[PDB]
Write a protein that binds this ligand. Sequence first.
Ligand SMILES: Cc1nsc(N2CCO[C@@H](C)[C@H]2C)n1
Ligand SMILES: Cc1nsc(N2CCO[C@@H](C)[C@H]2C)n1
Ligand SMILES: [Cl-]
Ligand SMILES: [Mg+2]
Ligand SMILES: [Mg+2]
Ligand SMILES: [Mg+2]
Ligand SMILES: [Mg+2]
Lengths: 194, 194
Amino acid sequence: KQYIISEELISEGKWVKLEKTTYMDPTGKTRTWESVKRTTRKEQTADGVAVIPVLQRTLHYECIVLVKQFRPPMGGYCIEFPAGLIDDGETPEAAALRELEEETGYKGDIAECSPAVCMDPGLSNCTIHIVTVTINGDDAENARPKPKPGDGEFVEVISLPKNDLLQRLDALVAEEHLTVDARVYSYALALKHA
Amino acid sequence: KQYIISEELISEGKWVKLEKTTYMDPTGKTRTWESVKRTTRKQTADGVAVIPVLQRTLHYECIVLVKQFRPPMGGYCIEFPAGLIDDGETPEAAALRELEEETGYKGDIAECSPAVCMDPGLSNCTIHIVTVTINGDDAENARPKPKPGDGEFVEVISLPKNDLLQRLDALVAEEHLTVDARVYSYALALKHAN
Ligand SMILES: Cc1nsc(N2CCO[C@@H](C)[C@H]2C)n1
Ligand SMILES: Cc1nsc(N2CCO[C@@H](C)[C@H]2C)n1
Ligand SMILES: [Cl-]
Ligand SMILES: [Mg+2]
Ligand SMILES: [Mg+2]
Ligand SMILES: [Mg+2]
Ligand SMILES: [Mg+2]
């Protein structure tokens, strides 16, 4: 029923643009929308990846490896799955393993890779693949993992037990001003509700 | 140790603006970020998203989702019922109201998250994730009456909680739809649990 009629640039930055979207509503009437897009998306199947990294080690409870970074759009520190944009010509799997190593030091193994999923579809066209990766924490490669942050990346690694994820996030949010990411919170909620 | 120095308006629509954020990196170097914000926040958060657990006896529990044309995406998305919180509305009340407008179901609050971020590398947008149960055997939910506001066009899709991820993959495979990242994250953790 509905479709895009036109997309008019309002303002293009170096990384993000705002567009005026004209579309057809399902009563055959024309409406507009204000749309955000990134300027960085080429032929990638999505803008980015987020990595669900399951750290597995003998005689440990499985942990979910999270990162804490300052996020200038938020004006504050945020707790998130490891994530980054997919480089031109890079596969979502390659992006995920690379980002995970850059941000956490860990060398993972791919488990699964989602289709492109929308970040905030009432606002932007931004998409990611959500990639599940297991980390063999008994491998010597992963013994004392050192992050390799790129320029202007400053990331702290926080591993929390899967079996208590939501409570452990609640405890961190209680102890300081930080925001938990909605996908991390959603995943912790489902772990509770299962 | 990181913080915002200043924000420069780049461009301001009715619903969204783009800003150039200056911030101090943790070495003491000054850096810029292109940040998106909504103009509508006044509020605990911009929005709510509702995780609606439809409970009917002798049936699988379902998670109730919505499918809607999203102009930023140029296509149809599957998402948790959701909307912006009205000035003076609580996150709980926004949840029950949006759930009702979009699905016609009347539900009870189970739990309510703190403000969580939607896309913190790009925007300051936040929501409250509100878990709501719906007593599907109650007369008020027998023939659920969706009350959409102006310009909303919402299809209701209820999926069993126990096979959520496989059911969503099927919809994507059959229907050229984009699943929301929070929905997909919750679906993932249902499978990953235990
Ligand atoms: C980002 C953006 N562009 S238009 C918009 N809306 C505000 C909420 O109500 C919708 C019917 C529509 C007018 N939000
Ligand atoms: C939206 C937006 N504004 S600046 C940005 N960048 C994303 C890549 O990492 C940083 C080095 C930074 C320059 N993304
Ligand atoms: Cl529940
Ligand atoms: Mg990153
Ligand atoms: Mg990175
Ligand atoms: Mg809505
Ligand atoms: Mg609504």
